[PDB]
Amino acid sequence: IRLPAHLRLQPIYWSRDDVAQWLKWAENEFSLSPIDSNTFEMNGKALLLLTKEDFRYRSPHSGDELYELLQHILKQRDL
Ligand SMILES: [Cl-]
Ligand SMILES: [Mg+2]
Ligand SMILES: [Mg+2]
Numbered sequence: 001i002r003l004p005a006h007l008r009l010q011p012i013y014w015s016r017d018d019v020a021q022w023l024k025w026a027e028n029e030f031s032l033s034p035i036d037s038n039t040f041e042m043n044g045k046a047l048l049l050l051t052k053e054d055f056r057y058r059s060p061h062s063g064d065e066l067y068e069l070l071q072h073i074l075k076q077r078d079l
Helices: 016-029 044-049 052-058 063-074
Strands: none
Touching: 016 044, 016 063, 044 063, 052 063
């Protein structure tokens, strides 16, 4: 479980393309239910404004995990 290099930047500087790459990494690394990138068409600054409920409406089957993954990155936790 190692973050892609470009995603090692603080998330507030993440592009919308970075967000898409994060979704792909997460899906593969944690074997999540498939996520459509069109459901998170936003940059990192916007992504950080989302609540857990917001993630779940965009990805009913993977939203919760995605939110908790982002929380772990923000907390600089390990993994
Ligand atoms: Cl902006
Ligand atoms: Mg930017
Ligand atoms: Mg972009």
